[PDB]
Design a protein around this ligand. Structure first.
Ligand SMILES: [Zn+2]
Ligand SMILES: [Zn+2]
Ligand SMILES: [Zn+2]
Ligand SMILES: [Zn+2]
Lengths: 222, 222, 222, 222
């Protein structure tokens, strides 16, 4: 009843088909990786980056968590960021939200009293919600959900950009761009939400919060 | 400069092909998910559970982090576990490690003084390594790398079974199986390193460390 | 070289004096505790709640961290909160900040690129600062340092009231008050910066940010 | 009923008494701190470092948490460590456990299934327990409790020593010692458990786990 056979057989079939189509498909990545992309996205079973962009092994390094959240104080996510930017030298960071995201719904409707770890974890979503409350007032449930997904994509794009890892990379002239994308599970389609950010100049143009003010706040003091 | 167009063309072409084959491929998961697997594996760019098991949207809920580590005190991993076991009622947890894993190499060689967050992050791999000194000392750096991989997988499976989430699911008679599997980037195949675990008895048989003593420790006192 | 003898002499001399004064000073708390206060304040070496409130062993349960920060996703602070509210049934939570706090200075001036863990840790202070730009921009670096302190205290009080722990205690009618106080290392005095908060109504009156909307956000939708 | 008056009045009385005894007691630390000690200890209301060593403001920088736990992946504790060692340049680190510690009891007797954050948090204690299970088998409840306190003091002393912050400090010849102490709440007395550790040489002599093996594991590979 709890038996892995269908899955190993499926992996078997999959590996032959790929090895037939091309002889070096697997062996060329046997002993290193040089991906050009880090993807950060939701753990949601409908959203598989390698599958949805049709990539081959070695192309995209992946963080997936509930809500596609990025925070300087989550060492799980930050270590995906530091290792890829500093050691593997990836060139592009994809931050991907999706519609129908359960975390973003929970972020709207759950009472903070709710027990367990998921409720602790989605605190970041409540913080995006509260900052943008005027954009969400008097929308319909389904409408506010959709807006919450998009607002969350933008906040997280901001946190990637404001992260020590990225700020440092840019400061030593390493090329690195950050992309805000969103996925529709019901159609299989990706849409670009935020045009490429390649440094501070771009972020000043594309982000609604002010990255420059965030990085250089003390210049405003007398 | 850093345009996403080729990724977007590839996604559109992919989404098209899939829906032409099966017209409800996407639409049937437009408004919910009911995966049966939670998968915990490595952020590594050569290891996509969706594509190596050939699964479709809505089948596997995925956590990916550096070194496929499971810890009670990582809210990021733990909320994936809580949400999939308590809300989505998944049935199987695949804990997957892989040969040539950079995190298991670093855990063998880096000096704890090393700066940055990946070094903090991989302390769990040092702890598994230290407990297992006698199985690793004196192997070639290469044989020990492969041994570290396997030991880590086994340690993480124990962490899954010992977690508050899996423990509470079991105690209330919710069916839930845990699996240790390892993947070879050079061949695209998955071996089952540890046979299915469905509760406390299976665990006594299948794991080197003692889960019953861990959970009911006060019984070995007086 | 680095002998502890003078600390040990001082401890023995102290313990002696106290028990000579009151012979059950220690022995009455030998086997349990029943403090009425949880105190959350700064790791700073000039701020000891026990001695500035002149309290004896068994009266105040203490969390101290860099910048007196309270977050749902810090298991270290949260377990102090959970254990004291749910197991010891404390009655009052003192959230205490202090002038000349290094963490609130760093949060004003450091560039997010700065290396190391204190910089990650103090992201919460940047977030309070960014929300409050209009109260800080253009003050002298010194007036703004003092303003940051107060704003942080107020933010942390809100975090305490908004936490799952305090929310659940309140909803089950457990009496629990939250207090904002700030301390002046130069004078040894404590001012009460925010008046007692004992539940949702007091909070509506006493805090700038909106706790009711935060907790019952889905009501402002349709 | 929820009223801070007794406490402010008490702080008032305390501040005058100290200002009378010495005119510069407070004012000498108004605008900086130069403590020689970081103390890491339990949040338990019976254990107040400034009070128990009879210290004046500015003498001891303090982390307090449930169980006096030190972990590379807790940024609360690590940021107390990094800021004090790197910025303030403290000379001595005190790691203090105490008997009758509730965390260490919970670490022995709780089942992992237990809900809430404290149970997540004390996972470190279960990990010390399991590693030392042979030392705890067939002792009486009260006996195993006492032993668990002492074992935990030694593990945490080890984690301070093995931490990136300390390893790095020692590696650039910064003087820094680490001390394992324990406190008896029922007597007010401290006892030195582990003699001063000032570098690797000392740790090889005083610690039961092998710090050198932990730091230089790869030297053992062929
Ligand atoms: Zn989602
Ligand atoms: Zn890996
Ligand atoms: Zn401070
Ligand atoms: Zn304790």
């Amino acid at each position: 009843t709890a038996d892995l056979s269908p899955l190993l057989e499926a992996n078997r079939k999959w590996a032959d088909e790929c090895a037939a189509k091309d002889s070096t498909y697997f062996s060329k990545v046997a002993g290193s990786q040089a991906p050009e992309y880090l993807y950060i996205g939701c753990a949601d079973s409908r959203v598989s980056p390698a599958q949805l962009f049709n990539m081959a092994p070695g192309e995209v390094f992946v963080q997936r968590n509930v809500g596609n959240l990025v925070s300087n104080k989550d060492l799980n996510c930050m270590s995906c960021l530091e290792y890829t930017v500093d050691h593997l030298k990836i060139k592009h960071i994809l931050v991907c939200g999706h519609y129908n995201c359960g975390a973003c719904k929970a972020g709207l409707v759950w009472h903070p009293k709710t027990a367990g770890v998921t409720n602790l974890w989605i605190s970041d979503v409540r913080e995006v919600r509260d900052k943008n409350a005027a954009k969400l007032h008097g929308l319909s449930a389904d409408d506010a959900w959709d807006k919450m997904v998009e607002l969350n994509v933008e906040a997280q794009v901001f946190n990637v950009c404001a992260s020590p890892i990225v700020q440092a990379a840019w400061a030593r002239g390493q090329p690195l761009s950050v992309h805000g994308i969103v996925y529709t599970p019901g159609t299989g389609l990706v849409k670009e939400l935020i045009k490429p950010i390649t440094g501070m100049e771009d972020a000043g143009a594309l982000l609604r919060a002010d990255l420059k003010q965030h990085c250089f706040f003390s210049e405003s003091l007398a």
